[PDB]
Amino acid sequence: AFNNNPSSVGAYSSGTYRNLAQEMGKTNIQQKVNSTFDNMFGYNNTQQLYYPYTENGVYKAHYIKAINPDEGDDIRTEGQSWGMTAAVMLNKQEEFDNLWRFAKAYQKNPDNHPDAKKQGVYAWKLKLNQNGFVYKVDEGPAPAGEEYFAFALLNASARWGNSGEFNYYNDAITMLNTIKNKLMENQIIRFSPYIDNLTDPSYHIPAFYDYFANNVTNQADKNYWRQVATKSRTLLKNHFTKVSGSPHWNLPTFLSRLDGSPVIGYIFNGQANPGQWYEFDAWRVIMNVGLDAHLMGAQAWHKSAVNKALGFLSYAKTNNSKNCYEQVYSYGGAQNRGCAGEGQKAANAVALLASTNAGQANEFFNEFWSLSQPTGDYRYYNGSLYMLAMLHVSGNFKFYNNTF
Ligand SMILES: O[C@@H]1[C@@H](O)[C@H](O[C@@H]2CO[C@@H](O[C@@H]3CO[C@@H](O[C@@H]4CO[C@@H](O[C@@H]5CO[C@@H](O)[C@H](O)[C@H]5O)[C@H](O)[C@H]4O)[C@H](O)[C@H]3O)[C@H](O)[C@H]2O)OC[C@H]1O
Numbered sequence: 001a002f003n004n005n006p007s008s009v010g011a012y013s014s015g016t017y018r019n020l021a022q023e024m025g026k027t028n029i030q031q032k033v034n035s036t037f038d039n040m041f042g043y044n045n046t047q048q049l050y051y052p053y054t055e056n057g058v059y060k061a062h063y064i065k066a067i068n069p070d071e072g073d074d075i076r077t078e079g080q081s082w083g084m085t086a087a088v089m090l091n092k093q094e095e096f097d098n099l100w101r102f103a104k105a106y107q108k109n110p111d112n113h114p115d116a117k118k119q120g121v122y123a124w125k126l127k128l129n130q131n132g133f134v135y136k137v138d139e140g141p142a143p144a145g146e147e148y149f150a151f152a153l154l155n156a157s158a159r160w161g162n163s164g165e166f167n168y169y170n171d172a173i174t175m176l177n178t179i180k181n182k183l184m185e186n187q188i189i190r191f192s193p194y195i196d197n198l199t200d201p202s203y204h205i206p207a208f209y210d211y212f213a214n215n216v217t218n219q220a221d222k223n224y225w226r227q228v229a230t231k232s233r234t235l236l237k238n239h240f241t242k243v244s245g246s247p248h249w250n251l252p253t254f255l256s257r258l259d260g261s262p263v264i265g266y267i268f269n270g271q272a273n274p275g276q277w278y279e280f281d282a283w284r285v286i287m288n289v290g291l292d293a294h295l296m297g298a299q300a301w302h303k304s305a306v307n308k309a310l311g312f313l314s315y316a317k318t319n320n321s322k323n324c325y326e327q328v329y330s331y332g333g334a335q336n337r338g339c340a341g342e343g344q345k346a347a348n349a350v351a352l353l354a355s356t357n358a359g360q361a362n363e364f365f366n367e368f369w370s371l372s373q374p375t376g377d378y379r380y381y382n383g384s385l386y387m388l389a390m391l392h393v394s395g396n397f398k399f400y401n402n403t404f
């Protein structure tokens with residue numbers, strides 16, 4: 001049965017990981033997790049997201065392909081870093097290394113880049129040109145990518161050691177220093193190096209920063225990352241307070257100021273959507289809250305955040321002619337961007353690790369568990385989230401500490 005009383009002590013401290021699928025009475029859990037990985041990383045052109053990159057017939061590395069029918073397929077740091085994370089959680093070392101090799105070679109901007117803000121950060125969007133060679137479309141970073149890269153590399157160091165192709169640990173420390181020096185403002189993760197007083201709630205994963213604190217050597221850096229963790233929980237708490245009730249109606253948003261205030265409308269040239277939309281980025285916020293609750297302990301704010309957000313989505317479904325909650329809301333109003341897909345449902349299943357409502361658990365978990373693994377033209381985002389969620393709800397998303 002669903003544990004509606006999540007412990008205030010996290011799995012990272014206790015070593016005790018919940019298996020949410022088991023709590024919900026599901027069978028063949030680990031087999032389903034395994035087939036999810038195998039299908040995503042297999043050469044089937046169906047669920048597949050993991051593709052080899054070759055130059056003149058010579059194998060180089062692998063990437064996660066952000067399949068895109070409208071705008072052309074591209075390659076993204078977040079997809080890449082999530083792929084590495086999935087691989088390390090299931091002890092899939094070749095897949096990890098092939099993805100990391102690609103990132104280090106083709107996504108990393110040179111440390112001597114003329115623009116100091118780009119030095120050592122990871123170009124968020126690549127494509128293959130008309131001859132099949134990789135190039136950077138936008139050299140700017142999407143910092144959730146670097147966050148996951150650092151997280152995946154620290155875990156790889158811990159599981160596999162550092163005597164093979166990669167010194168994972170040294171690569172992780174370099175990544176952490178890049179985040180600190182290039183991708184933070186006042187110890188809050190940036191949306192961009194080029195815009196101040198701006199964050200993206202979905203980039204906040206407080207437990208990762210605690211994990212970083214425990215895996216650096218020097219005292220100043222340990223304290224730095226602990227402060228980032230505290231400030232991240234405060235940002236998310238403040239954001240959830242601000243979106244409570246009218247006018248945001250309990251869903252977190254795409255963009256936020258550093259005090260947690262949703263960004264209203266447009267604020268910069270190139271901006272994809274209005275700041276106050278619950279949209280594709282924002283889907284992940286309560287998933288991150290669930291992650292944090294599970295790994296570092298469930299506090300009153302985690303519970304309130306997820307209970308109210310899932311509560312709104314359940315309500316929204318009853319007022320929908322197609323009996324679904326939708327992909328995009330603004331100020332509590334549906335923006336007609338379609339019924340929720342697999343990635344959004346996946347995000348909401350992970351949020352249940354902070355839920356105290358068995359009725360929400362039954363509804364949201366079964367809607368995720370009944371899905372087939374994503375296929376077709378929109379499988380990049382849906383499929384990547386689906387993979388992460390499969391790890392989170394099966395007790396397979398763990399923190400592996402390094403030893404010193
Ligand atoms: O110079 C600076 C610029 O570099 C800067 O650029 C920003 C860099 O960060 C970018 O953020 C990432 C964008 O990608 C997000 O994930 C998306 C979410 O959407 C998914 O696509 C949807 C899937 O579902 C379909 O139904 C729907 O139609 C799709 O839209 C997509 O697959 C994912 O990759 C990441 O979360 C972000 O981190 C940002 O876009 C850039 O603006 O901007 C500032 C400038 O000064």
Ligand SMILES: O[C@@H]1[C@@H](O)[C@H](O[C@@H]2CO[C@@H](O[C@@H]3CO[C@@H](O[C@@H]4CO[C@@H](O[C@@H]5CO[C@@H](O)[C@H](O)[C@H]5O)[C@H](O)[C@H]4O)[C@H](O)[C@H]3O)[C@H](O)[C@H]2O)OC[C@H]1O
Nearest residue numbers: 249250307308309310311312314315331332333334356357
């Ligand atoms: O566009 C705007 C419209 O969106 C707006 O409509 C309003 C939207 O919100 C509606 O209210 C929702 C009611 O349900 C809430 O979820 C609750 C949260 O609490 C849960 O209870 C917890 C369960 O577990 C216990 O252990 C725990 O102690 C409890 O706290 C409960 O199960 C959920 O159902 C949603 O968060 C609300 O959004 C409201 O009725 C609409 O009017 O109207 C204006 C328009 O502009």
